[PDB]
Amino acid sequence: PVIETVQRAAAALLGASAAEVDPEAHFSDLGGDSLSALTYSNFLHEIFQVEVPVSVIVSAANNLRSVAAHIEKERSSDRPTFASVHGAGATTIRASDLKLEKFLDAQTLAAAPSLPRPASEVRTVLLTGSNGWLGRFLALAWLERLVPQGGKVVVIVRGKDDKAAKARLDSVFESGDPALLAHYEDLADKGLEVLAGDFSDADLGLRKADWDRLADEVDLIVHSGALVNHVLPYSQLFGPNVVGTAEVAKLALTKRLKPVTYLSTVAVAVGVEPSAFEEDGDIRDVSAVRSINGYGNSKWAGEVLLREAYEHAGLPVRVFRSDMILAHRKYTGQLNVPDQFTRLILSLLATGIAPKSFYQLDATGGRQRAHYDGIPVDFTAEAITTLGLAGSDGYHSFDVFNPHHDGVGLDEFVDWLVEAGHPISRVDDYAEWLSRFETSLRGLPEAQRQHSVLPLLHAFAQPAPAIDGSPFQTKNFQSSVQEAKVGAEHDIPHLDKALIVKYAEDIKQLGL
Template sequence: MAGNPWRRYGRATDDFFALGGHSLSATRLMARVREESGRSMPLKDFFVAPTVRSMAAYLDAAGSELSADAAEIELNLPPRPVDLEAESAIALPTPLPPSGGMMQNVLLTGVTGFVGAYLLEQMLERWPGATVHCLVRADSAEDGLRRIRANLEEYGLWWDGYAPRIKVVVGDLAKPNLGLSGEVRDYLASEIDLIMHNGSHLNHVLRYGQLAAANVGSTKALLELAAYNRLKRFAYVSTGGVFNTEIGGRRKVDEDTDLSGEGFTDIEGYNATKWVAEAAVRKAGRMGLPIQIFRLGRVAVDSRSGAGRADDFIALYLRTCIQIGAYPDYPLVEKAVPVDYAARAIIALAGQPGGGEVFHLMGDEAFDWSKLLARTWPAASA
């Protein structure tokens, strides 16, 4: 099926969206399933359980009492406040171990994503003596390296000379201890000098409880790893979404704004998990761990090549307008930062001594995408 990433991987437990699927391809997939099987799976339920195995179980139960499954019930529950203090609790050893050495070994997560590709490329370019250990969900180290290479090739970043300096660590952010064996964890604890946690399960449909393992649990596991055996620097890639837009109307926020009162509910799943994970990182910083937090806004295409994600909101918006030959007569104003600039800034700042800093990489100028479309089709507004 065109646009179906399962065709490339074919495992019953593969996550459709983690393999490159997006909302439009999911809609086409659900239509094709309905056409072929005569049974339907609501799109909102597919977002909750986007695997072949889960979809098959749902379709098998269609028409029975089981069709109103736990995932659908979870989506329809009323919002519940997220307890920031309890959810961000973390235990680190006292006293902390001595600091490690120079930046020779780095552990990077999220390397098969858009921003992660540019972070890896910048690490390899700017830190020529560093080996980058990449945590990747894969069947093997060879499979993981193939995924990393394919991702960098997609954005025109790959160079064959990178391969010897990339070490694949097979793991899973959503599993306890990142899915690592004790032996692998001990090895990383003794070798790694810097942990950069960029990975997450990015989904704006699922609730907090459905994302917490991958987004909050992984952060805590990596913070514990940073304080195990020898002290490591910890850089956390966060989001401007940790500021709750539902409270206080228009307000000015900066790197020093206290986040404790943002008051997210579990229905604000992804942003709530990043809010809690940041709180855990800050707690670790107060305990003595050298931490940095980088908050990203809308990340735009590469300013040099124009390479970007085909499933990004702006890309999908523009593509849809082009396909129908019209655009909404309504402003779409976004501040954005080019992905290459964001990656260069993060790596430059992460390479400096210090700790405890928070950096905003949001973009300085707001751009109204509807004005671009108005210049393209002066009389095509809808």
């Protein structure tokens, strides 16, 4: 009796009794997370002989009863799947597999070439991933533009129902900053529609009525959503990142053509040297066979399908590859809490110790010039929204990285926290710092320790190479930002002291 096993497995896994784990509970509410969710997925897989993807277990849409329902269904009973596309238990994937024939119904494909062209005036945007870190500012940038022209922004969010989904959205904007909140509520009242859904599912997990309406009403689609996780295998990422990208394309190839903005990552550059990676090349020509880093490959496969859709039907695409997306420069408490950078700043303040340098020292033991490659999200959202609006034709890809040869890297960040009075001690020798720093992290209260850089300490094993600028190419993005005159900078910004200082305050204020 499936539900009873689901429960008992959960109890075992999470250190509860079976009485504490009622069917209406969510895996997350018992202390579940991505790590334990993987363990759970394999355990249930082995017992029932069916796929139980991590994404089923962690959706805010799914209690344990839903996970059990899924097992039942799959046990008896149809969408694209890793085996239907790549071959069952394959160990390589290849670009020649990722063909639209295998993701979409033939009828949709037959009609797409002769579909009406994109609307010349964008009045209603559909956005995925709006409760995500980047997505929330993409939503807010579209709202600031469209609401004053009486336009609309429709958003898809995971949740049990529309009101639940709306509530998940609302609370990402409650971050200790009243100004942000007033701003969001005001714009949201006027121009936001929130629908519960799931892009890994049929018709994006919506009611047929709303899918048929969006297919008619929507002028432009921004696909910011994905399962963003650097440990899961490709096969757990396939559903969200690949089939997800394809269900979005289905909407974009129905009733009339709809430009897609697609968020991606530098991780797609698997076994190619930075210097050899074309920012605006054909992505299918870049390691066209790959072994099974599943994040990178899942995002790549997404790109490839969109490329196939442009080749088939002339769907306008813009791809934006973006990795270290730092804190908002204006709204307080707004920062991506789980990201490596946040964790690091958190960790330096908690321990109060930093190395002379995070980077290779020189010949004589001295600090060298280095650069940290990230962009604040306020600019990133503005840039993406602006260049995405303008992409009504063709296919173009953009590396949203910070390319400046400015000498602004982690050592300047530490100097700046010190200049602003935070008590951080500088330790001359790196390997000493490293073992002291691990000691000091282990001594931390459990709440802090989990937020800190302690899980990812492998990545501070060595001092980083002392490198200015970025080795990947960024001229398409840099030159477009320049031409479009985005921001006060009319260029990619430089990371400044005001921002680093803001991170320490945002961290105090969120109570880490």
